[PDB]
Structures are given as structure tokens and as C-alpha cells.
Amino acid sequence: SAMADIGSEFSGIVQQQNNLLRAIEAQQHLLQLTVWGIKQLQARILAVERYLKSGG
Amino acid sequence: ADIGSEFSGIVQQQNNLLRAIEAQQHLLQLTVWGIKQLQARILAVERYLKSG
């Protein structure tokens, strides 16, 4: 039972680390998408700012 | 012995890592909301200036 118990306790941990890694990767995809969005917005706000002060 | 003691920093840490990810998800969810809100407010302005 000893060596067996130790094996299962390893397996659960390693499985869990993989879950955590996948979650982090998915979260990194989300982050990169938010960066895309922020860039998009920044440009459109910058154009609105210049337009209002090009008219001025 | 050393096994039970070793599994200790590891299990503690695994749960720490999990708690961190969950909290960062809440942060991601909040940045998404913020981005959606701004998008809608930029539009409102652009469409206002395109109609004016």
C-alpha cells in the first residue's frame, strides 16, 4: 500500500499542476485579447482627440 | 517522514496557486467589462461626430 499510496499522491498533484498550467495559458490568451482591445480603443480615441483639435 | 514533509510545501503551494488563478480571473473579468464599456462610449462619441 505504501509505494502505491505515494504513487497516487503524486498522480493527483501532477494532474493538478497540468490543470493549473492550462488555466494559466487560457488566461494568457484572455490577457492578450484585452491588450488587442486596449490598442484598438487607444487609436480610435486618439483619432477623435486629434479630429476635435484639428477643427479647433 | 521526508515524504509527508515534502508534500507539505507542495500541497500548500498548489492551493495557493489555485487561489491566485481564481482571483486573477476576477481581474480579467473586470478588465473585459471595462473594455466593453469604453468601446460603447467611444462609439457613442464617434457616431455623434459622424452625425454632427
Partner: peptide, 30 residues
Amino acid sequence: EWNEMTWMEWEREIENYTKLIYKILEESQE
């Protein structure tokens, strides 16, 4: 793979990744 990216695609990916992350976190709990 990312481009061509748009606000529609952006939204669709946000939703799928989020659901994915929820799935992983929920599997983590039990």
C-alpha cells in the same frame, strides 16, 4: 492564427476561453 481579429471574434474568444477556465477551475475543486 489571431488575425483577422474583430470585435465579434474578440467576444467569441473571450466567452470560450472564460468557459474553459471555469471548467478547469471547477475540475480543480473536487
